[PDB]
Amino acid sequence: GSHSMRYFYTAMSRPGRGEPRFIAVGYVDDTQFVRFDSDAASPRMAPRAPWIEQEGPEYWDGETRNMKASAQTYRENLRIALRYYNQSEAGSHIIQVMYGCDVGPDGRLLRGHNQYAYDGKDYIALNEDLSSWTAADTAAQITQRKWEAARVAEQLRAYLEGLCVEWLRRYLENGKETLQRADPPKTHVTHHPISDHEATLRCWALGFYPAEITLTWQRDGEDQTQDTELVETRPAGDRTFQKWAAVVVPSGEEQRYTCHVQHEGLPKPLTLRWEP
Amino acid sequence: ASLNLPAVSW
Amino acid sequence: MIQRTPKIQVYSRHPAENGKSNFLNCYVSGFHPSDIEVDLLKNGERIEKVEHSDLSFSKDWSFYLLYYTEFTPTEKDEYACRVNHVTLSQPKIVKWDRDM
């Protein structure tokens, strides 16, 4: 299917408690493969998936150098943001960065991404053209002007269309046993009376990869979106994900309800009911 | 591999 | 400053079977800023040496972390997750319920 690579940076100031912490993580699809943490005893880019371990010392040294340089850059950007927002040096603030590429089954670029946030709010983003910017406020417009003058978008475009896609293709081949394997959900429906009048039907999906899934309840063939409780998809810790969806139903009406499951690992969507 | 973007500040 | 309080789910890696080793998970998500305190509890007491995932975030910039520890569930033992964050006046305790 289609695939993505993403890097995520978080830079967090902590006045009075040293310099800002910088943490970076890299993902292919829903699989983390690298991390860097400036608070580690010996900071380095480190492997977090088996298929990246085969990269040689030049790779790891280059990634570590880049993360250390990025940490220094984002410590400076935290100071700059204080100025742009007229903020005191006493508070703690956070910059977040995301970037990466999406490719189709043919490995061709579908689109690239690069977005920035300050204190959890959009700051600036590279547009889909990989050539212009959208700034969220008058502070980010200062950054935009600086980045237009320095033709920063051209450097992002060159990475996103070049090295980003080329490395993603390499990782997908080296990790094909896992990155190119979808694990379908294991599904079942549970029933719990709430009172003499009503019961909960809960439709479960366990053990699936990747995380994207759709679980829906229908009553008499009509989706019950407003009456369904849907938990956030959650990691099991073994690469796979879990999710459930529940509805409260009148006792004796249970067979009017069907749970529908869509997942990339299923050749056809599943329909399930409570089996008493 | 990560993006190398030298000498770019906010 | 605009802050976001954590969502919390407590659950096991595999369906629980008394006497069978498993992993107990506390997934915290949707929060901002990133500092958060998470303890896993056994019969009200803090479990030592719990591990957690590396800090990451969702498309809306909110953070998520998985805290986890190996455990062998029994009929008797009660487990829970205790979470504190700047948005919370007191720590929030969520009990592990096998059916959830």
Side-chain angles (χ1 to χ4, degrees):
Chain A
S2 308
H3 297 281
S4 64
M5 185 162 70
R6 292 290 186 277
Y7 285 85
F8 303 104
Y9 304 164
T10 305
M12 147 164 48
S13 65
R14 46 183 171 192
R17 299 194 298 107
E19 287 297 309
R21 189 184 197 159
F22 181 85
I23 299 164
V25 295
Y27 283 79
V28 173
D29 302 326
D30 301 320
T31 301
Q32 195 194 334
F33 72 101
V34 287
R35 70 151 176 226
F36 176 92
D37 183 355
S38 64
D39 275 355
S42 300
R44 66 188 170 93
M45 193 74 104
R48 299 290 275 158
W51 45 261
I52 200 71
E53 289 177 22
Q54 64 192 96
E55 303 296 341
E58 71 296 318
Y59 178 90
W60 296 108
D61 290 342
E63 292 307 281
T64 295
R65 285 195 305 271
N66 198 37
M67 291 301 96
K68 291 178 178 188
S70 302
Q72 288 307 303
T73 296
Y74 277 85
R75 292 176 174 178
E76 184 186 14
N77 291 338
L78 279 159
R79 295 190 288 272
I80 293 165
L82 285 180
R83 301 199 308 262
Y84 289 1
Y85 291 107
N86 310 303
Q87 290 169 334
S88 155
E89 292 189 331
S92 305
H93 298 274
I94 298 176
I95 290 172
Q96 290 156 270
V97 186
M98 168 274 265
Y99 61 85
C101 45
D102 302 339
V103 301
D106 55 1
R108 280 190 43 233
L109 181 70
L110 294 172
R111 72 156 290 168
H113 301 269
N114 180 34
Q115 299 188 227
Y116 306 77
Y118 183 59
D119 290 334
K121 298 196 290 96
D122 286 14
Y123 182 77
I124 198 172
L126 185 64
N127 294 330
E128 190 174 8
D129 59 13
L130 313 181
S131 56
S132 60
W133 304 95
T134 296
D137 61 30
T138 57
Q141 287 169 13
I142 304 302
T143 299
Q144 178 174 344
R145 294 171 201 170
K146 191 177 301 201
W147 288 2
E148 287 166 342
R151 295 196 183 265
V152 171
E154 294 182 354
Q155 294 165 261
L156 260 295
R157 179 182 169 184
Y159 168 78
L160 292 168
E161 297 195 297
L163 284 168
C164 189
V165 168
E166 293 155 17
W167 278 107
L168 173 55
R169 289 196 286 268
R170 171 173 170 84
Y171 299 149
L172 285 168
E173 174 62 20
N174 290 351
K176 62 184 177 196
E177 161 191 309
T178 50
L179 297 176
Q180 296 189 56
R181 187 186 80 234
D183 296 324
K186 305 165 187 172
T187 58
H188 72 285
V189 174
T190 62
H191 179 272
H192 309 300
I194 288 156
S195 65
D196 292 353
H197 315 103
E198 293 179 311
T200 301
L201 293 177
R202 180 170 290 107
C203 184
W204 283 92
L206 301 170
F208 57 93
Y209 180 95
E212 173 61 34
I213 195 167
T214 307
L215 294 181
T216 59
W217 276 105
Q218 292 195 332
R219 174 187 165 93
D220 301 341
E222 281 306 305
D223 291 350
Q224 295 297 284
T225 305
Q226 194 63 230
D227 288 280
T228 299
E229 178 183 8
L230 199 58
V231 297
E232 185 184 2
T233 302
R234 67 200 192 186
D238 57 9
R239 105 172 190 126
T240 73
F241 297 88
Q242 309 181 346
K243 197 184 190 67
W244 58 255
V247 284
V248 177
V249 313
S251 298
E253 296 196 351
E254 285 86 349
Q255 294 309 308
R256 291 172 66 179
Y257 288 81
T258 53
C259 175
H260 299 260
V261 186
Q262 299 166 251
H263 187 268
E264 164 181 358
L266 296 169
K268 298 175 27 156
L270 306 188
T271 308
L272 291 86
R273 53 191 51 81
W274 177 45
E275 291 167 39
Chain B
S2 57
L3 164 72
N4 201 144
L5 205 73
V8 166
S9 96
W10 285 22
Chain C
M1 186 163 299
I2 298 300
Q3 302 177 317
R4 286 179 267 181
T5 204
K7 301 175 270 252
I8 309 167
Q9 297 193 65
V10 188
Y11 55 105
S12 54
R13 176 179 300 180
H14 303 116
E17 268 209 61
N18 289 331
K20 304 285 176 242
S21 181
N22 206 327
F23 279 83
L24 176 68
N25 291 330
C26 184
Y27 183 57
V28 289
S29 63
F31 58 98
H32 212 288
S34 52
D35 283 343
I36 192 165
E37 185 177 271
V38 181
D39 294 316
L40 299 183
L41 308 182
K42 179 182 181 174
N43 301 313
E45 294 305 297
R46 182 184 193 275
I47 298 170
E48 294 185 2
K49 284 152 63 200
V50 173
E51 298 168 277
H52 61 86
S53 59
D54 303 320
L55 186 67
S56 192
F57 54 82
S58 302
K59 290 177 35 178
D60 67 5
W61 308 108
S62 69
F63 296 101
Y64 62 85
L65 290 167
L66 179 65
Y67 286 75
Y68 57 96
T69 190
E70 202 144 12
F71 83 132
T72 297
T74 65
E75 200 200 329
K76 184 263 141 153
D77 291 324
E78 303 267 40
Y79 291 91
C81 186
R82 182 172 59 205
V83 177
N84 209 350
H85 188 255
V86 61
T87 56
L88 294 171
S89 67
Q90 292 94 20
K92 196 172 278 181
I93 298 175
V94 178
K95 284 211 52 39
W96 179 48
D97 177 357
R98 295 161 186 241
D99 313 308
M100 216 77 106

